[PDB]
Design a protein around this ligand. Structure first.
Ligand SMILES: CCCCCCCCCCCCCCCCCCCC(=O)O[C@H](COC(=O)CCCCCCCCCCCCCC)COP(=O)(O)OCCN
Ligand SMILES: *[C@@H]1O[C@H](CO)[C@@H](O[C@@H]2O[C@H](CO)[C@@H](O)[C@H](O)[C@H]2NC(C)=O)[C@H](O)[C@H]1NC(C)=O
Ligand SMILES: *[C@@H]1O[C@H](CO)[C@@H](O[C@@H]2O[C@H](CO)[C@@H](O)[C@H](O)[C@H]2NC(C)=O)[C@H](O)[C@H]1NC(C)=O
Length: 173
């Protein structure tokens, strides 16, 4: 299993040009696709799990996550100098264990194939997964952990929205 996993791969050839490739699976079955350049990013449910008005709402929130994700990469480069091209991998989701009182939720980010940062969702705080210190990772963490709604919203998305989605739709699988 009872889980929703989401994968997003973002290839930046420079701060203003990104190619997205992603997908999500519910209970081990492919259910959603993310594809295309920043200029036209398509997000589709392969199975008709949400009715059109509810999907439309889900999709605008996903597009707004992408806009902010891209904005943060541009901001990091603008303050600390990223080396392009680069590939960012976001792997996130929620799982209901059979022997569990509580969902396991996660959000891990890799850059160029190596561990970069990950979310500690209960405290709604990000940590470095690199043991290597860097101005890039320090600045990225300073932005991610700022006292604004963004990290508390992400916690709600993983702990509430994702979990309720699994509880509602896992039957249809
Ligand atoms: C169950 C519903 C979904 C159904 C399944 C759909 C799957 C279709 C697509 C395939 C998978 C693609 C990946 C999707 C991931 C995004 C998920 C949404 C995230 C999101 O909405 O976050 C909002 C906060 O934004 C943020 O948290 C912004 C964060 C910005 C930074 C990103 C963190 C990574 C670090 C950046 C790298 C920097 C690198 C520098 C070198 C909170 O939700 P909401 O209120 O908007 O929506 C309302 C619902 N809660
Ligand atoms: C997103 O799609 C990719 C590509 O189909 C999935 O990765 C494959 O997963 C299968 C089954 O686990 C493996 O046999 C392949 O080796 C994987 N290929 C690659 C290139 O990684 C991935 O599991 C999907 N993720 C989600 C959350 O749906
Ligand atoms: C991510 O990986 C890419 C490709 O491996 C890196 O791009 C290289 O950057 C070096 C500078 O050290 C250039 O000499 C090469 O021309 C680039 N390779 C290409 C264009 O294929 C990029 O620097 C890496 N970035 C991070 C942040 O790890």
């Amino acid at each position: 299993l009872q889980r929703l996993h989401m994968l997003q791969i973002s290839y930046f050839r420079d701060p203003y040009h990104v190619w997205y490739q992603g997908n999500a699976s519910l209970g081990g079955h492919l259910t959603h696709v993310l594809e295309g350049p920043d200029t036209n990013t398509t997000i589709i449910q392969l199975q008709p799990l949400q009715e059109p008005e509810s999907w439309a709402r889900t999709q605008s929130g996903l597009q707004s996550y992408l806009l902010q994700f891209h904005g943060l990469v541009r901001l990091v480069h603008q303050e600390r100098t990223l080396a392009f091209p680069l590939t960012i991998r976001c792997f996130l989701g929620c799982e209901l264990p059979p022997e569990g009182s509580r969902a396991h939720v996660f959000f891990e980010v890799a850059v160029n194939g190596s561990s970069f940062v990950s979310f500690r969702p209960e405290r709604a705080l990000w940590q470095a997964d690199t043991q290597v210190t860097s101005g890039v990772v320090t600045f990225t963490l300073q932005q991610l952990n700022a006292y604004n709604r963004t990290r508390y919203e992400l916690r709600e998305f993983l702990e509430d929205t994702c979990v309720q989605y699994v509880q509602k739709h896992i039957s249809a699988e």
